[PDB]
Amino acid sequence: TFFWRAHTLTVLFILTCTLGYVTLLEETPQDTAYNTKRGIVASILVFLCFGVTQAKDGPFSRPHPAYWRFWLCVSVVYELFLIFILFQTVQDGRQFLKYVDPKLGVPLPERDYGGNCLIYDPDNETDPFHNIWDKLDGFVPAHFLGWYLKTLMIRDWWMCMIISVMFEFLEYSLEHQLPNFSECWWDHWIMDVLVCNGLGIYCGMKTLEWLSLKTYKWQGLWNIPTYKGKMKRIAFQFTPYSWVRFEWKPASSLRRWLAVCGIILVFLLAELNTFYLKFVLWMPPEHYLVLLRLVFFVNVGGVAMREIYDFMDDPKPHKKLGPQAWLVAAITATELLIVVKYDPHTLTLSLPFYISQCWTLGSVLALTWTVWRFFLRDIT
Amino acid sequence: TFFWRAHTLTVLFILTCTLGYVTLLEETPQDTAYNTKRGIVASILVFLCFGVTQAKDGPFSRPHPAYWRFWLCVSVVYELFLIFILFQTVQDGRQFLKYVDPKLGVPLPERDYGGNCLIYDPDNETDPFHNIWDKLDGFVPAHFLGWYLKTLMIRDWWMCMIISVMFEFLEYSLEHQLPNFSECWWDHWIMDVLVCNGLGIYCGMKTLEWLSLKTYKWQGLWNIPTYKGKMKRIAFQFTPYSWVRFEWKPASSLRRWLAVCGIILVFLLAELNTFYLKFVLWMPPEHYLVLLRLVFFVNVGGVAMREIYDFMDDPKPHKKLGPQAWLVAAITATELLIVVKYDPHTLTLSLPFYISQCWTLGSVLALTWTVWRFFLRDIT
Ligand SMILES: CCCCCC/C=C\CCCCCCCC(=O)OC[C@H](COP(=O)(O)OCCN)OC(=O)CCCCCCC/C=C\CCCCCCCC
Ligand SMILES: CCCCCC/C=C\CCCCCCCC(=O)OC[C@H](COP(=O)(O)OCCN)OC(=O)CCCCCCC/C=C\CCCCCCCC
Ligand SMILES: [Ca+2]
Ligand SMILES: [Ca+2]
C-alpha cells in the first residue's frame, strides 16, 4: 500500500530532474516545427502529472483514484483543444488536425453501406448471405461492448432502452442530412437494437445484479492466505469497492422530470456529435483518434453519470455539481457548436415530411402526457 | 450572500451562450495569425472560468475563494507556458515572446546604474545630490511595498531579515555574472536594506500585531446598523477572516531545520530567477509582463507560504502538500532551468576570489554550527 499514500515532492523531484536532463543534457534541434510539438507534448505531460498527483478524488476510487484523476485531466485537455479548434476557420482547423496526424486534411471518399437489402436474395446463387456478409463487420462486436458499458454507466433498464430507441429514431431521421447513413430496416433493428437488448443490456443488468449481491470486505495483500488467496486478491482488486445502483424515478416532481429529460438529451447529443465530428473534421472512421475519443467518453461518461446522480439525489438545500459532469456537458456543448459551425449547409437540410409528421405526433403525445400528469396531480 | 453559493450550471450556460454567439453569429476572419491568438486566448479564458467555478478552496477565503482559485489557475497557465518556452530553442522562444508583444525579440541596450558613487561629490557644484537624484527612482517606493507584502507572506522577523540579507549578499556576488548589476555600497545598504527594515518590515510586523489583536465576529450585510455600519462592513469585508501567525522554530530537529533551509532557498531562487528572467528573455524591466509576474508571485507566494507552513506543522503521520506550494516550487524550478539553458555562458563565469573566500568561510561556519548542534544534542 506504499503507492496509495506515496509522497508528492518525490514526484516533483523526479519530474524536474527528468525534464531538466532531457532539455539541457540533450541537444535542441534547429527546427521549430519539431520543437513546437515537443513543447506542447511536454506541457500536456506535465499538466497530466500535476493533475494526477494533486487533483480531487471523485466518487470512484478503485482501482486507484489516480486513474480517474488522469481521466479528468484528459477531459480538461480535450475541452481546451476542442475550443481552440472551434475558434479558428474550417480549413485551418482541418490543417491543425493534419498537424496532429500527417494524413488528415484531405477529402476522404464517401461510400454507402445499406445499398443492399432483402437478405434472402436470389441475385447471388453462390451465397444466400452475400448481403449479410458485408454487414457483419467490427460494428456488431462493438455494439455489445458499447452498450454493456453504457448500461453499466446509467444503471437502469427503462432509461437505457429509451435512450437506445430514441437514438435509433434520431439516426433514421439523420439519414438525409449526412449521406454516410445507409442501413436497411433489418440491419437497423434486428442487427443493432435486437443485439443490444439481447446481449449487451442483458449482460450489463446481469453483472449489476451479480455484483450488487456481494459482500465487500477487503484486507491487506500480505495477510491473505497462500497463492490461491494471492491470485484471488489480485483479480478482485479490479472489482469495484461498493456501488449504489441509481434509481431514476421521474414521475415524482417537475424539476426531476426535466433533469431526466436533460440527461437523456445530453446522452443523445453525445452520440449525435460523435458521428458528426467523425464526419465533419475529415477523419476516417478507423482513425485512432476516434477510438481514443470513444474510450475517453466511456470512462468520463461513467464518472459524470454517477456524479450527476449524486447531485440529483441530494437532500441538502444547495450542492455544487461535480466537476466531471460539468466538464462532460461543456465538451458536449463545444462539440455540438463545432458541428454546427463547420458544416451548416449539410445540417440545415429540411426533414423528410413523412418522418416530420411522426416527430410532431411524438411531440404532441409528450405534451398530452405532461398535461395529463398535471391534471392527475391537481386531482390528487 | 447570493454570489457566495451561486449556481454553476448558470455559469456553464452563460459561457456556452457567449462563446456560441461570438463564434457563429460573428464572422471569422480569413487570417490564421489572428485566429490562432484568438483561440489560445479563448481556451485560457475558458480554463480560468472552469477553475474559478470548480477548483478547490485554499486556506485563504476572504474576500472570496474565487480570487484564490483564479490565482491558482493563473499559476497553472504560467507553468504550462514556461515549460513550452523552455522546450524550444532560444531564438524561437524570444520570437514567441515577440508574438506575445510585437516589440520584444530585439536586443535591448545595456546601461549601468552604480557608475556614480561618493554622494558628497564636488564634481557638480549646482546640486550636491546629483548622484542621489538618479538613484531616487521608482525602485525605492517599490521596495517598501514589496517587503511589506513579503513580510506579510512569511510572518516572521528573523526569517525575513535573514532572507533579505542573504538576497543582498547574493546580489553582490551576482554583479559580474550579470552586467546590469551596478550599485554603490550606500545604495546597496542604506537605500535598500535600511529602508526595508525601517519601513516595510516594521510596518508589516505592526500590521500583524494590530490585526492579530482583533475580535473576528461577522454578521450579515443587512443586519448591521445604518450607513455608518454599512460603510464599516464594506471596508472590513476586505480584512482577513482570522489568521494564525507562523512560528518557524528550526532548532528542534533536523528535518524541520532542512525544511526551513529549503523554503529560504526557494525564496532566494525566486528573486534570482526573477532578475535573470527579466534579463535573458530580452524583456525590458518596465514591460507589463514583469509587473504581472510580480503581482502573481506576491499572491501565489502568500498562499503557498501558508500551505507549506500547514504541511510542516501537521502532527498527522502523512499529509499531502497543498497544490499551491507544489505549483510555486514547480514554477521556480522551471524558471531556473530556463535561465540555465538560455544563457549558460554568462552564468558560468567564475566568482571573484575575494568574495569566494567569504562564501567558503560562511559555508564552513554553517557546517561548524551544525556539528555543534549535533554535539549539544548528543550531550543533552
Ligand atoms: C467508467 C464507467 C464505465 C466504464 C466501466 C469500466 C471502465 C473501463 C473500461 C474501458 C474499456 C474501453 C472500451 C472500448 C470502447 C468500446 O468498446 O466501444 C465504445 C462504444 C462503441 O461505440 P458505439 O457508438 O456504441 O458504436 C457505434 C455504432 N454505429 O462507444 C460507446 O460506448 C459510447 C459511449 C457514450 C458515452 C456518453 C457520455 C455521456 C454520459 C453522461 C453525460 C450525461 C449527463 C451528465 C452531464 C451533464 C449533466 C447536467
Ligand atoms: C497573498 C498574501 C500576500 C499579499 C497580501 C495581499 C494580496 C493582494 C496584494 C496585491 C498587491 C499587488 C502588489 C504590486 C507588486 C509590488 O508592489 O511590487 C512587487 C515586489 C517589488 O519588487 P522587488 O523584487 O521587491 O524589487 C526589486 C528591487 N531590485 O516584488 C515582490 O514582492 C517579490 C515577491 C516574491 C515572492 C516569492 C514567492 C515564493 C514564496 C514562497 C515559496 C516558498 C516555499 C513554498 C514552495 C515550496 C515548498 C516546498
Ligand atoms: Ca445503426
Ligand atoms: Ca539592490
Side-chain angles (χ1 to χ4, degrees):
Chain A
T1 181
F2 163 59
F3 284 64
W4 269 252
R5 79 217 179 288
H7 203 37
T8 177
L9 292 172
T10 294
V11 173
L12 174 53
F13 151 73
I14 288 178
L15 158 77
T16 289
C17 183
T18 291
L19 74 98
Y21 164 77
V22 78
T23 314
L24 313 184
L25 264 71
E26 203 218 8
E27 46 95 34
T28 56
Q30 304 302 94
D31 63 321
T32 172
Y34 174 46
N35 286 319
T36 302
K37 270 183 282 301
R38 219 191 182 205
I40 296 194
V41 169
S43 314
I44 287 169
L45 263 55
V46 172
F47 176 52
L48 285 186
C49 178
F50 153 70
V52 159
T53 188
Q54 293 270 342
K56 215 183 302 163
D57 308 332
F60 294 163
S61 166
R62 214 145 274 193
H64 201 314
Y67 192 92
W68 315 104
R69 288 193 288 246
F70 163 56
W71 278 123
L72 184 64
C73 294
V74 166
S75 179
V76 167
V77 160
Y78 184 38
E79 171 54 354
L80 293 201
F81 268 122
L82 273 177
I83 293 179
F84 170 70
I85 286 183
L86 167 63
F87 259 88
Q88 312 197 245
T89 50
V90 306
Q91 49 187 355
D92 299 340
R94 297 154 182 178
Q95 306 307 314
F96 175 71
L97 282 159
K98 176 167 210 161
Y99 287 155
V100 165
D101 168 80
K103 301 251 169 281
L104 311 181
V106 79
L108 52 146
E110 196 272 345
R111 284 299 304 118
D112 72 314
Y113 308 141
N116 43 333
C117 308
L118 314 169
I119 44 180
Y120 196 63
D121 213 353
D123 293 7
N124 218 358
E125 173 67 10
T126 74
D127 210 332
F129 303 91
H130 91 72
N131 326 65
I132 285 190
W133 279 147
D134 55 52
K135 294 291 186 177
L136 199 139
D137 218 328
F139 266 100
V140 161
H143 268 295
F144 171 73
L145 272 61
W147 272 102
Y148 178 47
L149 298 173
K150 282 180 285 187
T151 198
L152 285 189
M153 291 155 48
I154 58 184
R155 285 172 179 150
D156 214 20
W157 200 298
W158 145 81
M159 167 159 180
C160 205
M161 105 178 163
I162 208 57
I163 284 180
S164 155
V165 152
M166 258 322 307
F167 174 50
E168 267 306 324
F169 285 148
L170 186 83
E171 190 146 300
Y172 186 69
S173 196
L174 227 50
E175 171 143 310
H176 92 286
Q177 325 143 320
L178 154 80
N180 72 359
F181 275 156
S182 71
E183 288 188 329
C184 312
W185 83 279
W186 60 271
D187 167 41
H188 258 297
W189 299 111
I190 315 302
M191 286 337 147
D192 295 335
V193 164
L194 173 146
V195 86
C196 298
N197 275 39
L199 312 181
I201 281 190
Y202 173 49
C203 261
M205 282 341 278
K206 262 283 193 172
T207 278
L208 287 189
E209 290 175 343
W210 207 317
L211 296 205
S212 279
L213 245 197
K214 206 178 69 174
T215 318
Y216 313 102
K217 284 319 287 191
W218 320 89
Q219 60 164 208
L221 190 53
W222 308 120
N223 306 358
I224 50 185
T226 61
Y227 303 119
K228 180 62 210 153
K230 182 183 153 85
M231 162 185 208
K232 177 60 136 51
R233 190 53 169 91
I234 294 302
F236 260 49
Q237 171 60 23
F238 290 56
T239 57
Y241 209 111
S242 44
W243 55 32
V244 169
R245 168 166 131 72
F246 324 139
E247 300 194 347
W248 318 85
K249 33 215 162 293
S252 45
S253 179
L254 324 178
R255 196 279 283 254
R256 191 181 198 95
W257 174 244
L258 294 185
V260 180
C261 279
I263 58 193
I264 282 183
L265 200 76
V266 173
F267 224 106
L268 290 184
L269 285 189
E271 298 150 11
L272 176 142
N273 70 30
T274 285
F275 268 72
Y276 261 100
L277 252 199
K278 96 174 179 34
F279 164 74
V280 76
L281 284 186
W282 281 351
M283 322 186 258
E286 88 273 349
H287 206 247
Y288 66 90
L289 277 165
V290 186
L291 318 180
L292 289 191
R293 173 190 193 285
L294 288 173
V295 164
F296 152 68
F297 251 100
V298 161
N299 293 273
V300 79
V303 184
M305 262 305 317
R306 160 66 171 202
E307 282 199 346
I308 185 61
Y309 177 60
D310 275 4
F311 168 92
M312 172 202 97
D313 196 42
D314 69 331
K316 62 152 62 173
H318 41 263
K319 175 155 172 324
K320 189 162 58 180
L321 179 52
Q324 194 68 279
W326 202 94
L327 270 175
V328 167
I331 291 186
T332 286
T334 292
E335 282 178 344
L336 169 71
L337 287 179
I338 287 176
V339 169
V340 176
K341 166 182 193 172
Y342 271 47
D343 203 358
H345 283 287
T346 307
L347 182 43
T348 192
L349 286 167
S350 314
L351 266 67
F353 190 68
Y354 74 98
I355 195 68
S356 66
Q357 286 288 357
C358 300
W359 286 111
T360 60
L361 264 45
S363 181
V364 71
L365 195 161
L367 185 55
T368 56
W369 181 94
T370 301
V371 65
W372 179 87
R373 178 72 281 184
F374 263 104
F375 260 104
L376 192 55
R377 176 180 295 99
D378 188 8
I379 296 184
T380 299
Chain B
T1 180
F2 164 59
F3 284 66
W4 269 252
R5 81 218 176 289
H7 203 36
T8 176
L9 292 172
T10 294
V11 173
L12 174 53
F13 151 74
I14 288 178
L15 158 77
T16 289
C17 183
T18 206
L19 74 98
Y21 163 77
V22 78
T23 313
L24 313 184
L25 264 71
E26 203 218 8
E27 46 95 34
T28 56
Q30 304 302 94
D31 64 321
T32 172
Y34 174 46
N35 286 319
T36 302
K37 270 183 282 301
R38 220 191 182 205
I40 296 194
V41 169
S43 314
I44 287 169
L45 264 55
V46 172
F47 176 52
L48 285 186
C49 178
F50 153 70
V52 159
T53 187
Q54 293 270 342
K56 215 183 302 163
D57 307 332
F60 294 164
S61 166
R62 214 146 274 194
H64 201 314
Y67 192 92
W68 315 104
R69 288 193 288 246
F70 163 56
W71 278 122
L72 184 64
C73 294
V74 166
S75 179
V76 167
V77 160
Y78 184 38
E79 171 54 354
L80 293 201
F81 268 122
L82 273 177
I83 293 179
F84 170 70
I85 286 183
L86 167 63
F87 259 88
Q88 312 197 245
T89 50
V90 305
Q91 49 187 355
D92 299 340
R94 297 154 182 178
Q95 306 307 314
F96 175 71
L97 282 159
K98 176 167 210 161
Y99 287 155
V100 165
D101 168 80
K103 301 251 169 281
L104 311 181
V106 79
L108 52 146
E110 196 272 345
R111 284 299 304 118
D112 72 315
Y113 308 141
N116 43 333
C117 307
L118 314 169
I119 44 180
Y120 196 63
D121 213 353
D123 293 7
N124 218 357
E125 173 67 10
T126 74
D127 210 333
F129 303 91
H130 91 72
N131 326 65
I132 285 190
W133 279 146
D134 55 52
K135 294 291 186 177
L136 199 139
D137 218 328
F139 258 101
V140 161
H143 268 295
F144 171 73
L145 272 61
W147 272 102
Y148 178 47
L149 298 173
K150 283 180 285 187
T151 198
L152 285 189
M153 295 160 38
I154 58 185
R155 285 173 179 150
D156 215 20
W157 200 298
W158 146 81
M159 167 158 179
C160 205
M161 105 178 163
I162 207 57
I163 284 180
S164 155
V165 152
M166 281 305 327
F167 174 50
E168 267 306 324
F169 286 147
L170 186 83
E171 190 146 310
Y172 186 69
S173 275
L174 258 205
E175 166 169 271
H176 92 286
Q177 331 164 258
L178 155 81
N180 72 359
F181 275 155
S182 71
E183 288 189 329
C184 312
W185 83 279
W186 60 271
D187 166 41
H188 258 297
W189 299 111
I190 316 302
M191 280 333 142
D192 295 336
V193 164
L194 172 146
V195 86
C196 298
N197 275 39
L199 312 181
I201 281 190
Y202 173 49
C203 274
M205 281 341 277
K206 261 283 194 172
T207 278
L208 287 189
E209 290 175 343
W210 207 317
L211 296 205
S212 279
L213 202 43
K214 206 178 69 174
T215 318
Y216 313 102
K217 284 319 287 191
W218 320 89
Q219 60 164 208
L221 190 53
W222 308 120
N223 306 357
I224 50 185
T226 62
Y227 303 119
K228 180 62 210 153
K230 182 183 153 85
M231 162 185 208
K232 177 60 136 51
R233 190 53 169 91
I234 294 302
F236 262 49
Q237 171 60 23
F238 292 57
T239 57
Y241 210 109
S242 44
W243 55 30
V244 169
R245 168 166 130 72
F246 324 139
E247 300 195 347
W248 318 85
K249 34 215 162 293
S252 43
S253 178
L254 326 176
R255 197 280 280 254
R256 190 181 198 96
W257 166 263
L258 294 184
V260 180
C261 279
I263 58 193
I264 282 183
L265 200 76
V266 173
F267 224 106
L268 290 184
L269 285 189
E271 298 150 11
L272 176 142
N273 70 30
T274 285
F275 268 71
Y276 261 100
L277 252 199
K278 96 174 179 34
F279 164 74
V280 76
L281 283 186
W282 281 351
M283 322 186 258
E286 297 71 353
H287 206 248
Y288 66 90
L289 277 165
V290 186
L291 318 180
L292 289 191
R293 173 189 193 285
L294 288 173
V295 164
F296 152 68
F297 250 100
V298 161
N299 293 273
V300 80
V303 184
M305 262 305 317
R306 159 47 72 104
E307 282 200 346
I308 185 61
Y309 177 59
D310 275 4
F311 168 92
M312 172 202 97
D313 195 42
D314 69 331
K316 62 152 62 173
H318 41 263
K319 175 155 172 324
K320 189 162 57 180
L321 179 52
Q324 194 68 279
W326 202 94
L327 270 175
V328 167
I331 291 186
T332 286
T334 292
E335 282 178 344
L336 169 71
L337 287 179
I338 287 176
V339 169
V340 176
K341 166 182 193 172
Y342 271 47
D343 203 357
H345 283 296
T346 307
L347 182 43
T348 192
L349 286 167
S350 314
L351 266 66
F353 190 68
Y354 74 98
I355 195 67
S356 66
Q357 286 288 357
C358 300
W359 283 106
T360 59
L361 264 44
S363 181
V364 70
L365 195 161
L367 185 56
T368 55
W369 181 95
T370 301
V371 65
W372 180 87
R373 178 73 281 184
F374 255 103
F375 261 105
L376 191 55
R377 176 180 295 99
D378 188 8
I379 296 184
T380 299

